[PDB]
Design a protein around this ligand. Sequence first.
Ligand code: HEC
Ligand code: HEM
Ligand code: HEM
Ligand code: HEM
Lengths: 47, 51, 60, 238, 68, 101, 79, 379, 109
Amino acid sequence: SHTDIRVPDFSDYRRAEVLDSTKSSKESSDARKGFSYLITATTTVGV
Amino acid sequence: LSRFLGPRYRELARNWIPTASMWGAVGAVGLVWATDWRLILDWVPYINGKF
Amino acid sequence: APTLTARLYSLLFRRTSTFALTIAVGALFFERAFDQGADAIYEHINQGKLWKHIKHKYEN
Amino acid sequence: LELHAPSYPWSHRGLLSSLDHTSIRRGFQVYKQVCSSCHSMDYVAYRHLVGVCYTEEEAKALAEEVEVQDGPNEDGEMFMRPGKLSDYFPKPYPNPEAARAANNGALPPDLSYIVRARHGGEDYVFSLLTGYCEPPTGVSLREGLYFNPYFPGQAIAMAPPIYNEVLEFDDGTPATMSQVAKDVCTFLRWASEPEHDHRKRMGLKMLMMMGLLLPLVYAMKRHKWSVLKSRKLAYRPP
Amino acid sequence: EELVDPLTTVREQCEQIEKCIKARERLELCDQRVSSRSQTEEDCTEELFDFLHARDHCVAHKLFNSLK
Amino acid sequence: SKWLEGIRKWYYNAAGFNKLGLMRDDTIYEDDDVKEAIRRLPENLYNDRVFRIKRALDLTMRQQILPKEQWTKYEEDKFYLEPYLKEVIRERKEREEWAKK
Amino acid sequence: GREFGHLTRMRHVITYSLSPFEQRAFPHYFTKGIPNVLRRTRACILRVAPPFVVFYLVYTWGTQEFEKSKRKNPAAYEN
Amino acid sequence: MTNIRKSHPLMKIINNAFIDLPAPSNISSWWNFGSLLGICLILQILTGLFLAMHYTSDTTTAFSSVTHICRDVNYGWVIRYLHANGASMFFICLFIHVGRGLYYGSYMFLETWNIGVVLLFTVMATAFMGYVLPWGQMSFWGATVITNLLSAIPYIGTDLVEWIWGGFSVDKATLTRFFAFHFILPFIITALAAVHLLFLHETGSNNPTGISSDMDKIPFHPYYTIKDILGALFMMLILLILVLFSPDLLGDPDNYTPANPLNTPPHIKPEWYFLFAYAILRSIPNKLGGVLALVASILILILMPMLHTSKQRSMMFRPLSQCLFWMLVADLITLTWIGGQPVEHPFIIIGQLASILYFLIILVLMPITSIIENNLLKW
Amino acid sequence: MTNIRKSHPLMKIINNAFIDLPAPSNISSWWNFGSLLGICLILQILTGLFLAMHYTSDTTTAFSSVTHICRDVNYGWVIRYLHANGASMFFICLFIHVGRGLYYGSYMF
Ligand code: HEC
Ligand code: HEM
Ligand code: HEM
Ligand code: HEM
């Protein structure tokens, strides 16, 4: 009925900070984006 | 290829066999002319004057 | 209390131009440091064999 | 039947090991004093020794020690010149026919790529130089041939070139046959691969860079593909 | 004082080794066979090759320590 | 025939498409006849086939397999596409036989 | 031609996904990969290995036979 | 307003080819090699170009010019050995790509498969002439043998061989011909590869399951651009290992002696990527039969689509066909090994059996096994 | 059924480029040179290639190789002078093409 469909749990994939459902994502958005972009920047430096 | 094993294709071949034979002659004459075979051009009455 | 990665993103990685400037400066300094370290490792492995280790005995 | 050379523990057989430039200098002394009389190294010049085993002034002194034929003068006839580091190592013979005539019809090969031209390389050369032996019963060698078990056919036209005290090293190292053979083989390996040390250094640098990059690019790929690899799909027919 | 090279020492060191010794005795047998006959065509190159292979393997493992 | 049934079951298990939840007719190569047969399938069968194929592709993307009890059982495998494909091939054969005359 | 707008007709399929910045790149990398790698190896080994085992046996036998053929035959020198 | 990436003509072509291309989501790492091939090609051009800036195709200067490249040119050794080992990497990727096509039934793309066969022949010719270029002993004598193979052609063999040679044997004329042809062919290869991708994009790419993947398609760019970059990085790692630690591993030492027309080297064998064909060539005692077998060894790929008798496309669900495929791969490895080995007692018979097995597996065993599998699946 | 010329990919490209391309009915002879340029290009590629089968790029063997082409190679002089004068024809056609573009306002593309 489009209302009995529930998003399946992704907790086994979610990063550590965003695991808690009662804690806002904007708190750690900068940290996660910075981690991924630091990986990207180091890769680009090596390349 | 049993799809083509029919009476119509037998008739179709007979209709195009003369045409295919003519194109084969064009290829044969062309090959002899282009390569100057001279195994065949020796028989040709006027061309055999060369070599 | 933002973490180190959060500070990095806010200062440098958020804007693509600053991202590229950080990449360029890091490329310069990483090239220098990596070349120095790799040369040190290679010369330590081949210590006493290279010309720069024996040239002094023949320099004048 | 043929005999394969053993794998001697050369100091450059390591994954990142370079050459012993002292051994290169000793091997060059061996070359200029022993095999230069019959063998040639066309593709090696004195300038190639400047950054390897001899300083620039020493290389100039080595070059000036041998006369080299120069281009036509005003009269139009060739003359001789003291030599310079731009010159290549002198040819012992003018043409290969002269070399064959002087060596009983056998052409002494050029040693610039010898270690790179023979299977086994420096191992084969070292086993050949030190492997001269009295021919076994049943072997009949033609005149002017010597039995070397490692040379194909076991009948080589090269008389044993090295022996104890064949040359007196400048470095003072004892001039045993094994020492001379090892030094000359190291020098010939340098001649075949003058980029050996630089190639090893670049290989180390590229190994470090690849060890840094491959996990990083792999992490980037995993980051991009996480969307699909965590994707949960459901089928909800009415 | 005659500047004894390590090569002779190492070759002698192998020559007293089970592989070196067995190859040497088989080489001696082949030598006796060839010498005994008058116009035989057989050669001792093969057995010599076996002996030299074993000995030079040992020499490769031992020699370079002594060389400077 | 019992040995034939056993070897058929063994080959069905060996051919690992059941491990992906697929059915036999999902793995068929989509040539012209198969394309037409798929286009003739009723809507429910077509939707089921599409979802099964998509799920199999998702599984193969992650190099994973369906749980042991979710594999398609050999005895409950349905040849849903077979009748439609048989009819399509029969029609093609009839057209070719007419063309032969 | 073939474009994302019109490739196939699909109905009633729901896909849930996550942002790359909300999920871990290597989740349970070893604890799940190693059993999965072992499963794939067990599945594929009986299909892949035997031809290469046969090739290795043939290679060893051929090398041994060639080396034996190069060896001297005593019976040729009986006299 | 509009989007430049979707409207501009060149941008349209590039977007439809590499950015917005619908790609199957389940294609494995075996699909990287295609892109890898392209990279190799690009490399083989760039590197090759920087070898032509110093190489001179004259018998009196070719070997000396190569030694100058590897002795005097700044980083000339890097470029030279990158070229030499990149050719081997190109053929490794070619063999793996053809194996992927055979295994997953990718040959059902008839036009793509045929253009691929043409590409394979062109690359083989380019590599042969490029190997002749250094004018070493190996180059000269391998060229002599391979070109002399053409003399087996009846009634035109001698004339054709002497026309290709530009004389009575392999000499300066042949060397310059080969330099020109080797320079020009890779650009024809690039054009053929463009046509190849054009044909491939007409139906999209296949997938390991062998089932149409239109229900599960992803944009090529975000996923497969980075996946192909990672694959190219791994290929570059392998190539740089070969160029910086064993630059002479896949070569032959006898190619470091200047070509001697009056003295054959101890052994005459071609580069490893040809050995298998060479092995087949040596199985047939007859010269013409050997040449025909060598040609058929590659032309069998043309027959491959017609030999497909199974109801399923990929071999992923055909264990018996998988066993046959791996037997074929082991057989190809055997043929390569024997082509390396001399023509003596065990090698002759093993090579004859291996060639027979290769043709039998590709022609007879595989269709029969596919029919058996079809009967086992009740269709 | 369909038409192979209008359906096959390569045939589609060729048909839309040189077969069914809508072209103005009044373009004068000045619009020939474009195609001529292509012709010239192909010629320079063919002829030049056959010069590369005998030319060596060493200063000690460059002039001698060119004379070898002009004296010894069969019809070598034909190919050499075809190349030399075809470069000049290429530039004549290029200049006429640019002049046509300027005169008829073709630079608006
Ligand atoms: C007596 C003159 C002479 C001397 C001195 C000499 N060589 Fe040679 N060398 C020859 C000749 C002649 C041959 C080839 C003989 C043959 O091919 O039958 C040869 C062959 C060789 C070979 C093997 C070539 C092959 O085809 O296997 C090597 C290696 C070599 N020389 C290196 C050296 C080195 C190193 C030295 C210094 C220790 C040296 N030579 C000194 C004359 C000489
Ligand atoms: C698919 C493309 C190519 C392949 C497979 C290929 C293959 C080869 C091979 C195997 C060699 C032998 C090298 C050696 O043994 O030392 C070679 C040499 C050479 N190639 Fe190519 N090549 C390709 C493209 C090119 C291109 C595009 C050029 C020039 C623009 C070029 C120029 C040369 C030159 C000058 C040599 C001789 C230099 C040398 O041998 O070091 N190659 N090539
Ligand atoms: C220089 C040579 C070649 C180049 C540059 C090249 C390039 C490519 C590329 C980029 C792809 C797409 C990536 C992929 O699907 O893996 C591809 C796919 C393909 N190639 Fe090649 N290729 C070459 C040789 C060959 C050969 C030798 C064959 C067959 C004998 C071949 C047949 C195919 C086929 C059938 C596909 C489609 C595979 C599929 O969709 O499953 N190609 N090629
Ligand atoms: C737009 C294309 C080209 C132009 C405009 C062009 C132009 C020229 C010109 C002006 C010369 C001087 C000839 C002389 O002074 O005698 C020349 C020589 C030469 N070209 Fe071309 N060329 C072109 C393409 C090519 C190509 C594609 C090749 C090889 C594949 C080639 C190979 C040569 C060679 C080997 C020479 C020296 C031979 C000789 O000078 O007789 N050229 N070219």
